Amino acid sequence: DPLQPELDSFKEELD
């Protein structure tokens, strides 16, 4: 996914 870095940043918010 070309937007995987943005998805990673959102994943980091899932605490």
Epitope: D1, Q4, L7
Partner: nanobody, 114 residues
């Protein structure tokens, strides 16, 4: 450089479904990931779901019940919400993310009652 507007909220029976839309106006929408958050009065805002061009991420709170999807031809991202519970009641708001820059919508109300 996009503006976002949410729609599709309402008042629905417990166990029912809604489909929210996050519509974007502006250029290069395909270069933004789209994230849904929700926030009830008195509480903190929490992440719900995210989509890139096609890959998706879900909070554990909605896994198996919600599905996020994207149609760039319509500059729209959808959040299909199934098996809704009273605890899903909140304002749902979308967020377009391009690198470290974030744009936010306004919010649409979702109320779930039995």
């Amino acid at each position: 450089q996009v503006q976002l507007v949410e729609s599709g909220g309402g008042l629905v029976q417990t166990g029912g479904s809604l489909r929210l839309s996050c519509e974007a106006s502006g250029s290069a929408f395909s270069s933004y990931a789209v994230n849904w958050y929700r926030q009830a009065p008195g509480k903190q805002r929490e992440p719900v779901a995210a989509i890139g061009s096609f890959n998706t991420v879900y909070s554990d709170s909605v896994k198996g019940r919600f599905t996020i999807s994207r149609d760039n031809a319509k500059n729209t991202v959808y959040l299909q919400m199934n098996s809704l519970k009273p605890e899903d009641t909140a304002v749902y708001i979308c967020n377009a993310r391009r690198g470290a820059t974030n744009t936010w919508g306004q919010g649409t109300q979702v109320t779930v009652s039995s």
